[PDB]
Write a protein that binds this DNA or RNA. Structure first.
Ligand SMILES: [Mg+2]
Ligand code: NA
Ligand code: NA
Length: 1216
RNA sequence: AAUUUCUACUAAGUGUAGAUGGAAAUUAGGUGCGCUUGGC
DNA sequence: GCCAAGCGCACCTAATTTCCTGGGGGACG
DNA sequence: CGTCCCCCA
């Protein structure tokens, strides 16, 4: 139904780079020659050593960083902090704050760069001279020296390290981490300190000062602005984060920090004071913790030795177990008034064992407390009652006996509980005798031996279970009637028992490590800039090039002693030829053109007039306040005339420049050079001579391979295969360029062939898709799971540049708004997140009619009339639970990110098809990053990865099956989001993607716009009366068997957003109360009113309901109102139950019930609650489009797209 | 159950469909368990 | 039984930066 | 004096 072709305007907008990856298959004697020359062994070792030198470099860099950071006093500080906290900042003061912030980052950067040695930190000098002089170990110095003549292999690393010293507000900069992140967090903590300082006791602060600040400072100092300098190094950050978080002493004492005190205060007084934010680490610091933690275990034998020695039936830990066993079996020989349960968790624990639940003791104590202290229920009553309870330090079992049933005995019940726990220990020790004798020997190493770890953990856990049970009986410690006959023997045994605590942690810590696995390593063929680029005039330096033979492509690498061997090969006018690439790139002309033409070589050849010289010297050609259009033109003509005399470029490129007088800046000349400064063609080379080179070992050749190049391949190729071929296709006019920087790696086999699951030839294999009617496949060859990991495999990574010279430049967001404004029937794809439905889709047209709606829990695909349906929701759930249980059982934690990615790529493909079909924009929830981060715990969270892979696709969106040269084909992909720089830099619109407020998109009656604005939580009897009276009427409706509640929202607070105001609610249908029960509203109302003798038929019922005096009537009434206003009804784990039901009637007296539409195949209204949300997310974008239609084009950028809550209820309640 | 790699497959027999930006560096987060002090 | 503040250990996940280069130049045999 | 690693912007 689309009226306007919008996607076609979004091609060739901006450039991006990608990487294509291939297997590289050695040809001929290549592998033998590489083996004989030891190249792979040298490179596997160089990789190890390279990482080692990077670690030594980091030692020097960190030392250089700390010296500078320790020595810096930021100047602005007090100024910046003042403005940063000012609450009434003009736009002019906000630019001011930005300036102060830039200057703070510049103080930090310039302090780094002002050292005279600074430039040397990223050139050959740091490996040749500086790091050797800085090191002392002879072996470390010789590792660094081995890279002499090889420093340009660190060039990328040098860039990583230089990022640390940028003054820019960029994530890998020290200045950013200091100023944008930590100063902000430091300033925030200053406001919190002033709010919360009054709760801290002077002895609490004094403990922190003594035990954390060494009495060298006051806690208050770290909340003064000027003190922020202390916190620039890791050393200061650790101190500051210890003030916040405390630390653990060598004895295991947890010294409390301020956040603990805040949390303790909050829980004591039922308040919610905010807490402090810890500071982030300083870049590159190797930080050691202020908390003590005992040393672990390092070998399977240490663990087995520890486990056998500390836990066998004769060990001192097992002794204490039997000793405590005897103490409890002899309970009645001890005075029950003499032994105590400390109040709090031990009382909760004992309560749940003796009575089933943690709170029964608490409730029974309140019972007798109420009997003394009752004559209605204030907050003051329960505060005093709770304070009185909190005062009781412990309970004797005698005291506890008085809470038991006549059949119950407390002392009895306890001793059978400990007997059960000792029983279990023996039952698990019995299963453990196999590794408790000396002769036993592991066959599988512990970190990969589930069977032995299961046996240890079961034993460990049962001792933990027993240990946690007996810790309840310690009492408070200062009870007077303390049966020291009972406790003397208890404390001795208990204290030995606690020795298990270190053993439990230490074994867990060892046994859950994953076994190390080796990485692929980069190959250099003894060139530090190996394969750096493809330019013909560099072949001899880079020693890698590309060949082609029919449809197959090859990587050709010259041995360093024979760098020229391919250039001495000519065409074979008789027998076969390879095609050898001829690649010319003039990269970054604004840098290379001056470099080449004002070089000593060129100025000597070419007499450049003093005018030309001064023009470049003084920079009168650059766009700026020193510009001179005529100077610019003279320089261009110098460059143009030099090009014609530079055969290296005049013969490689078909230059065709615009007339000089037409240029505005020199940039317009550079752009033409850049675009025409790329040419790729192929030259013939004798196949015989080339193959001789390979046999002789002078040349190494790899077929550049993926399965699309197999002689057996016959289906649609990978998109990346198409990209690769298009690089060399003469119909590609620079839309996709082959880039330099390619890399070659060796990935050693990680599986042995013998251990691969095999499917023998000629034996049937089961097919898995139940909808596939061919149940079985039988092949004449073997197939092996994961075969590719069972052999060493070279891989070749090739960068490409798409839209390197973009012509179609404009504001993408603006243009989208211009199109939607002028579009007659714009379509919107609404997409809703969830965890009942990972993703739900609703497509609407320009009038908001639903065109499609469905869940993406399952991906449905068709192959030749054969359906395949994949329940990815179910797969992700299973993986989630395997990961959860693996974490709990100390077994291997499987990956989930690849399954999510596999799912999301199916989702993105379908959304792309919907975008192209309907020419539609996309509507999403403006989830801030504070909601997306709290749903990370639900490891089926898919929405962040969905956004990421969606925006990636929409940066260059291609239909594989289209003509590569047509709009939307591989050479003309649509670019309908802004180039993806970062999530943080995005706004609420990203090209075709709109982010709208999600308020009341799900919990809303789509047929009427009705929403629940009432607060129905029971708070008091008086509060419920005023609620009831605030209705205009409450009556029973005999002719419908419903209760009707007339209300004007104007009589309840927090309702100004509603538009209709007057609504009649009905007790129509059922609700799901949350375990769960189904509740029929009408009958439940009747049940409630009958319980209290209310004549609910006596017309207007409100006065009657307010005459009640029982608090349980009003709480039950408010509960029933809550259910009536609960339009969304769900059973977790019952994906069949997610319905939406409205308590209000539409125009025709119908109640909306989503179940009436989920039946239908095509439904006009949402089929459930998740579809409702997607539907109204889309409608909110429809509203914003309406706003576009109200503005002039010149003002479309200014149109607010975030509909107000008030605007949305009006919109939703007048659409119908 | 094959893959540049990932997911789902066997798709008609060494493979099929879709996806796929690498590399390096930095940093943050999440799950789980234990321990300390607490709340329900 | 659940949860909070903090410390620790094991694991997996992911955000944000940089580069995607030929040719002059020199150190070095 | 040519080769090869370095360095640039
Ligand atoms: Mg294919
Ligand atoms: Na954690
Ligand atoms: Na915790």
């Amino acid at each position: 139904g689309s009226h306007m072709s919008k996607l076609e305007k979004f091609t060739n907008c901006y450039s991006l780079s990608k990487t294509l990856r291939f297997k590289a298959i050695p040809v001929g004697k290549t592998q033998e020659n590489i083996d004989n020359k030891r190249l792979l062994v040298e490179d596997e070792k160089r990789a190890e050593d390279y990482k080692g030198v990077k670690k030594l470099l980091d030692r020097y860099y960190l030392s250089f960083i700390n010296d500078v950071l320790h020595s810096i006093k930021l100047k602005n500080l007090n100024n910046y902090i003042s403005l940063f906290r000012k609450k009434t900042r003009t736009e002019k003061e906000n630019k001011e704050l930005e300036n102060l912030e830039i200057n703070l980052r510049k103080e930090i950067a310039k302090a780094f760069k002002g050292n005279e040695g600074y430039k040397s930190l990223f050139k050959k000098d740091i490996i040749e001279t500086i790091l050797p002089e800085f090191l002392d170990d002879k072996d470390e110095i010789a590792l660094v020296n081995s890279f002499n003549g090889f420093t340009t292999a660190f060039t990328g690393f040098f860039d990583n390290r230089e990022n640390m010293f940028s003054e820019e507000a960029k994530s890998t900069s020290i200045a950013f981490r200091c100023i944008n992140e930590n100063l902000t967090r430091y300033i925030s903590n200053m406001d919190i300190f002033e709010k919360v300082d009054a709760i801290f006791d002077k002895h609490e602060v004094q403990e922190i000062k003594e035990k954390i600040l060494n009495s060298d400072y006051d806690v208050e100092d770290f909340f003064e602005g000027e003190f922020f300098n202390f916190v620039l190094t890791q050393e200061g950050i650790d101190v500051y984060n210890a003030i916040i978080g405390g630390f653990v002493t060598e004895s295991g004492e947890k010294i409390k920090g301020l956040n603990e005190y805040i949390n303790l205060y909050n829980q004591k007084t039922k308040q919610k004071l905010p807490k402090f934010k810890p500071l982030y680490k300083q870049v590159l610091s190797d930080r050691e913790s202020l908390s003590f933690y005992g040393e672990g275990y390092t070998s399977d034998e240490e663990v087995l030795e520890v486990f056998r020695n500390t836990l066998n039936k004769n060990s001192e830990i097992f002794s204490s177990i039997k000793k405590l066993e005897k103490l409890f079996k002899n309970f009645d020989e001890y005075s029950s008034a003499g032994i105590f349960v400390k109040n709090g968790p031990a009382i909760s624990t004992i309560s749940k064992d003796i009575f089933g639940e943690w709170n029964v003791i608490r409730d029974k104590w309140n019972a007798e407390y109420d009997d003394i202290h009752l004559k209605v229920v204030t907050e003051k009553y329960e505060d005093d009652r709770r304070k009185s309870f909190k005062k009781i330090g412990s309970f004797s079992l005698e005291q506890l006996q008085e809470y038991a049933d006549a059949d119950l005995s407390v002392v009895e019940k306890l001793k059978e509980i400990i007997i059960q726990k000792v029983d279990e220990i023996y039952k698990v020790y019995g299963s453990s005798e196999k590794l408790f004798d000396a002769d036993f020997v592991l066959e599988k190493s512990l970190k990969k031996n589930d069977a032995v770890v299961a046996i240890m953990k079961d034993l460990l856990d049962s001792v933990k279970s027993f240990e946690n049970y007996i810790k309840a009986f310690f009492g408070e410690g200062k009870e007077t009637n303390r049966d020291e006959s009972f406790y003397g023997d208890f404390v001795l045994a208990y204290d030995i028992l606690l020795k298990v605590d270190h053993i439990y942690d230490a074994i867990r810590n060892y046994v859950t490590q994953k076994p190390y696995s080796k990485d692929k390593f980069k190959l250099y063929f003894q060139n530090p800039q190996f394969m750096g680029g493809w330019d013909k005039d560099k072949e001899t330096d880079y020693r890698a090039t590309i060949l082609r033979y029919g449809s197959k492509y090859y990587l050709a690498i010259m041995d360093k002693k024979y760098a020229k061997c391919l250039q001495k090969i000519d065409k074979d006018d008789v027998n076969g030829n390879y095609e050898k690439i001829n690649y010319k790139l003039l990269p970054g002309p604004n840098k290379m053109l001056p470099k080449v033409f004002f070089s000593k070589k060129w100025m000597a050849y070419y007499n450049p007039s003093e005018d030309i010289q001064k023009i470049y010297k003084n920079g009168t050609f650059k766009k700026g306040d020193m510009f001179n259009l005529n100077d610019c033109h003279k320089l261009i003509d110098f460059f143009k005339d030099s090009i014609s005399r530079y055969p290296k470029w005049s013969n490689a490129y078909d230059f065709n420049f615009s007339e000089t007088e037409k240029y505005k800046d020199i940039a317009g000349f550079y752009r033409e050079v850049e675009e025409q400064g790329y040419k790729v063609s192929f030259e013939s080379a004798s196949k015989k001579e080339v193959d001789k080179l390979v046999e002789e070992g002078k040349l190494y050749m790899f077929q550049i391979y993926n399965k699309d190049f197999s002689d057996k391949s016959h289906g649609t190729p990978n998109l990346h295969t198409m990209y690769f071929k298009l690089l060399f296709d003469e119909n590609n006019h620079g839309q996709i360029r082959l880039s330099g920087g390619a890399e070659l790696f060796m990935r050693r086999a990680s599986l042995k062939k013998e251990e691969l699951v095999v499917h023998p030839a000629n034996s049937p294999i089961a097919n898995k898709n139940p909808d596939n009617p061919k149940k079985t496949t039988t092949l004449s060859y073997d197939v092996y799971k994961d075969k590719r990991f069972s052999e060493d495999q070279y891989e070749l990574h090739i960068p490409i540049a798409i839209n390197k010279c973009p012509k179609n430049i404009f504001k993408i967001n603006t243009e989208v708004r211009v199109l939607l404004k002028h579009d007659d029937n714009p379509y919107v794809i609404g997409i809703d997140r969830g965890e009942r439905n990972l993703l739900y889709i609703v497509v609407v047209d320009g009038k908001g009619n639903i065109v499609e709606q469905y869940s993406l829990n399952e991906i449905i695909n068709n192959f030749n009339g054969i359906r395949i349906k994949t329940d990815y929701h179910s797969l992700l759930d299973k993986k989630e639970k395997e990961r959860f249980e693996a974490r709990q059982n100390w077994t291997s934690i499987e990956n989930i990110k690849e399954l999510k990615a596999g799912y999301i790529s199916q989702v993105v493909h379908k959304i792309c098809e919907l975008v192209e079909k309907y020419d539609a924009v996309i509507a999403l929830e403006d989830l801030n990053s504070g909601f997306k981060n709290s749903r990370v715990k639900v490891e089926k969270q898919v929405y962040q990865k969905f956004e990421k892979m969606l925006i990636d696709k929409l940066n260059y969106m291609v239909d594989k099956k289209s003509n590569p040269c047509a709009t939307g084909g591989a050479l003309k992909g649509y670019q309908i989001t802004n180039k993806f720089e970062s999530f943080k830099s995005m706004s609420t619109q990203n090209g075709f993607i709109f982010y709208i407020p999600a308020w009341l998109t799900s919990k809303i009656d789509p047929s009427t716009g009705f929403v629940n604005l009432l607060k129905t939580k029971y708070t008091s009897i008086a509060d419920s009366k005023k609620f009831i009276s605030s209705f205009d009427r409450i009556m029973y409706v005999p002719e419908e068997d419903l209760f009707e509640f007339a209300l004007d929202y104007k009589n309840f607070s927090r309702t100004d957003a509603d538009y209709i105001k007057k609504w009649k609610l009905y007790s129509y249908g059922n609700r799901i109360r949350i375990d769960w029960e189904e509740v029929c509203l009408t009958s439940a109302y009747k049940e409630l009113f009958n319980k209290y003798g209310i004549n609910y038929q006596q017309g207007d019922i409100r006065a009657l309901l307010c005459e009640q005096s029982d608090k349980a009537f009003y709480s039950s009434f408010m509960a029933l109102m809550s259910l009536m206003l609960q339009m969304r009804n769900s059973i977790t784990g019952r994906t069949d139950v997610d319905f939406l039901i409205s308590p209000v009637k539409n125009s025709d007296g119908i109640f909306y019930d989503s179940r009436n539409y989920e039946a239908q195949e095509n439904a006009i209204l949402p089929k459930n609650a998740d579809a409702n949300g997607a539907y109204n997310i889309a409608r909110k974008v429809l509203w914003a489009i309406g706003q576009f239609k109200k503005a002039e084009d010149e003002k479309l950028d200014k149109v607010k797209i975030a509909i107000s809550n008030k605007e949305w209820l009006e919109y939703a309640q007048t659409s119908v």
